[PDB]
Amino acid sequence: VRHVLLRQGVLGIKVKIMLPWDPSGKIGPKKPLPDHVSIVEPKDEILPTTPISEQK
Amino acid sequence: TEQMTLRGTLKGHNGWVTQIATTPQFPDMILSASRDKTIIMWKLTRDETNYGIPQRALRGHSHFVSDVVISSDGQFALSGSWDGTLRLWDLTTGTTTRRFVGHTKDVLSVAFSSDNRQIVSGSRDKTIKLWNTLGVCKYTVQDESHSEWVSCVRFSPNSSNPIIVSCGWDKLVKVWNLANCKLKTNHIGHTGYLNTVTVSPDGSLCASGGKDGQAMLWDLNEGKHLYTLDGGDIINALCFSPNRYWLCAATGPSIKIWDLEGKIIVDELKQEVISTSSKAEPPQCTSLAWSADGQTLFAGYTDNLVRVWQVTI
């Protein structure tokens, strides 16, 4: 919030910015928004299966 | 004809019954771990008006007790709970002698050596851990281990060269040389996670089950896969026999007991059949244990009850 005086009275400036969640970085914050549940999806599971016991 | 009969029922718990363990030394004392954080040691009064009374409640644990096992002499018990800690009790007073700290997630299984010299524990960290009997970390299987929850770990009973075996949530049964703690062989199959694992008293077979509903028999000597039994609904705990060639399986509401000779079901232990007026009608079955006499089996359910089943002729 900043005042700026001109030839006729003062004006008031107000700036608000939202920081874009820098993870592990410092351009925004860490610790994302509370209502931000996020799900990961894996793979490499195969349905073709035959009971083979391979040794090592 | 060999048949099973409901002898009696034991009461005294407050949540699910998760494990039951008997020792061949004292044929009149039972251990029952439950979800009420306590471990009940029973006064097995063999009468028929009741069948047993809790003798002493081993207390002190901050969450569910997932596994318990009795020592070979009957003076100690080992326990593993859902706060990551293991506890070594004294069956005479209580007074946990040693807590085995070191884990980041819940402790699922626990097992005791043949001479009660090493300890093994599997957890949700995908870590198998070996311990000295004094409460220190001997060895950790960090990688080449399961990629998911290590649901159960067991020792082989053999004095001939030693195996430990572990099943996990990565649908794999992995087997280890106990001296070296490296892999011996893999075992693939079992579409779905794995709930249990067990070794026959002759130390030659591993009967593994899980979500799939099929119990698979693996050979500890040949390194192969013998055969499969479709257990029907789902497998919670598989236990071999002390003086027979059977295999007791805990299905959802029932217990399926196979004669392995011709691989045929002997019985279907179903409890009472009230018309449950909605939804899942029956209280499911969690654990089961064969008595060293080979005469009666104990079964722990999800409705706070422990039921007895006697072999009758």
Side-chain angles (χ1 to χ4, degrees), chain B residues 71 164 270:
Chain B
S71 162
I164 70 174
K270 295 257 302 312

Side-chain angles (χ1 to χ4, degrees), chain B residues 193-264:
Chain B
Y193 58 98
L194 290 168
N195 265 109
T196 176
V197 115
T198 165
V199 178
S200 311
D202 82 340
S204 201
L205 307 166
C206 167
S208 126
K211 184 196 189 55
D212 225 346
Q214 337 161 336
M216 303 204 187
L217 284 298
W218 318 82
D219 41 74
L220 298 186
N221 294 290
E222 296 138 79
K224 292 195 180 84
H225 155 73
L226 288 203
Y227 51 83
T228 307
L229 321 177
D230 202 68
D233 169 275
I234 219 155
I235 300 175
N236 287 318
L238 288 157
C239 76
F240 278 116
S241 325
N243 57 26
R244 284 176 184 89
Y245 273 81
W246 302 332
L247 175 53
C248 220
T251 50
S254 38
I255 316 176
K256 296 185 72 160
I257 176 69
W258 283 265
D259 179 359
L260 296 178
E261 308 319 301
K263 299 176 289 188
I264 182 61

Side-chain angles (χ1 to χ4, degrees), chain A residues 22-34:
Chain A
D22 202 355
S24 73
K26 295 309 153 291
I27 76 148
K30 276 169 297 216
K31 173 186 27 63
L33 279 160

Side-chain angles (χ1 to χ4, degrees), chain B residues 13-160:
Chain B
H13 269 321
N14 245 8
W16 294 7
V17 203
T18 42
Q19 274 260 31
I20 306 208
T22 321
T23 203
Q25 276 284 355
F26 314 141
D28 231 3
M29 176 219 58
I30 310 298
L31 274 193
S32 145
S34 198
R35 265 190 178 196
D36 70 335
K37 309 166 176 49
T38 59
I39 296 180
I40 282 183
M41 155 192 144
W42 299 87
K43 178 62 174 59
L44 240 189
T45 73
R46 290 284 185 181
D47 309 285
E48 293 313 296
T49 65
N50 63 339
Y51 199 64
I53 297 108
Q55 180 78 290
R56 179 177 314 293
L58 291 324
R59 280 155 284 100
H61 259 150
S62 1
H63 215 332
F64 300 155
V65 176
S66 89
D67 197 358
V68 74
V69 63
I70 310 191
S71 162
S72 48
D73 356 332
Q75 309 294 156
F76 297 84
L78 193 78
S79 185
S81 89
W82 275 34
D83 39 44
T85 56
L86 277 59
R87 285 211 166 189
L88 188 51
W89 302 93
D90 278 294
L91 257 61
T92 304
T93 37
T95 40
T96 130
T97 301
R98 191 75 177 167
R99 44 181 165 275
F100 297 73
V101 63
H103 259 314
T104 36
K105 282 134 177 169
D106 317 327
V107 160
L108 286 181
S109 266
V110 114
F112 231 153
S113 300
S114 56
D115 59 344
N116 311 339
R117 181 68 189 186
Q118 295 101 317
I119 295 176
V120 70
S121 102
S123 100
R124 289 205 156 100
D125 318 38
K126 327 151 191 178
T127 47
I128 303 85
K129 208 154 284 195
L130 271 86
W131 315 75
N132 307 55
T133 165
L134 308 191
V136 284
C137 192
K138 187 181 274 283
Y139 189 66
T140 278
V141 188
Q142 203 74 66
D143 55 11
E144 94 228 320
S145 46
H146 299 272
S147 158
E148 310 276 70
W149 303 351
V150 182
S151 42
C152 164
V153 189
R154 289 292 186 280
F155 286 103
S156 61
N158 295 326
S159 53
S160 58

